[PDB]
Amino acid sequence: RWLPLEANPEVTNQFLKQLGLHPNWQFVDVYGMDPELLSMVPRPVCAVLLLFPITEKYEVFRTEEEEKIKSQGQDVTSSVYFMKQTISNACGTIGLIHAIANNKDKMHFESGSTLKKFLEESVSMSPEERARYLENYDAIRVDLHFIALVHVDGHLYELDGRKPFPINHGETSDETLLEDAIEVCKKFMERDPDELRFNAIALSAA
């Protein structure tokens, strides 16, 4: 049912088509975080999806991050569309939904778009309700984990349905989203320095 758990621009772009999106935005590989490989990515970029592995090492950081934000708070704009995860194999599809939901006004939906209908129906549901609706909503059908990195109201949000909330990673813009999101990706990698299994795709203007 779900997007397979591999960073694969062409399968993702095919699924976008089938969800009712015109191809004015298309996913591309991000070949590395190096400037030489980063500068290859078509711009504007309105979302980065990161595929990474959920390790013990990852998990201790995640719990610390949750505890630190519960103590010290963070800002999450009400514009942010967040959805909880209830099935782990759904994480790629959830990442795609986060990327598109938080850029809905950049997208060109076909009239009968199944994703368009899911988004307009789910505009006022809770993150938890949205996961339940997604489980029911048959039409969205085609260790490793996806997150989405998007720019909303001047800040970079990591959207991971495993977490209680979006994570505010600081300021960013339409223009610098690719760089600012890859900074966050490199922070993921730094935390798990022996782990090879990090692959990103960028939702680029086409």
Query: End-to-end distance of the chain based on CA atoms, in angstroms?
Result: 27
For residues 177 and 38, give the distance between their C-alpha atoms in angstroms, rounded to a whole number: 12
What is residue 79's DSSP assignment?
Answer: T
For residues 186 and 169, give the distance between their C-alpha atoms in angstroms, rounded to a whole number: 13
For residues 53 and 198, give the distance between their C-alpha atoms in angstroms, rounded to a whole number: 7
Expressed in percent and rounded to 5, the helix, strand and coil fractions of the chain are: 40, 20, 40
For residues 172 and 41, give the distance between their C-alpha atoms in angstroms, rounded to a whole number: 18
Task: Check if the beta carbon of residue 13 is closer than 8 Å to that of residue 27.
Answer: yes
For the question of residue 185 being annotated catalytic, the response is no
- Reference 148, options 194, 181, 105; nearest CA is 181
Structure determination technique employed? X-ray
Task: Check if the beta carbon of residue 199 is closer than 8 Å to that of residue 66.
Answer: no
- Reference 132, options 146, 121, 144, 143; nearest CA is 121
For the question of residue 46 being annotated catalytic, the response is no
Which candidate in 46, 98, 145, 185 is catalytic?
Answer: 145
Element (H, E) at 97: helix 91-101
For residues 167 and 79, give the distance between their C-alpha atoms in angstroms, rounded to a whole number: 14
Q: How many CB atoms within 10 Å of residue 112?
A: 8
| Backbone CA torsion sign across 150, 31, 184, 53 | positive
- Of the candidate CATH numbers 3.30.70.520, 3.40.532.10, 3.30.930.10, 2.60.120.620, the domain formed by 1-206 belongs to 3.40.532.10
What is residue 125's DSSP assignment?
Answer: S
Resolution stated for this PDB structure, in Å: 1.8
Which candidate in 91, 151, 155, 185 is catalytic?
Answer: 91
Domain boundaries, the chain: 1-206
**Phi and psi at residue 194, in whole multiples of 5°?**
-95, -15
**Phi and psi at residue 47, in whole multiples of 5°?**
-165, 145
**Phi and psi at residue 204, in whole multiples of 5°?**
-110, 150
What is the distance, to the nearest Å, from the Cα of residue 79 to the centroid of all Cα atoms in its chain? Answer: 15
Structure tokens at 9: 């621009």
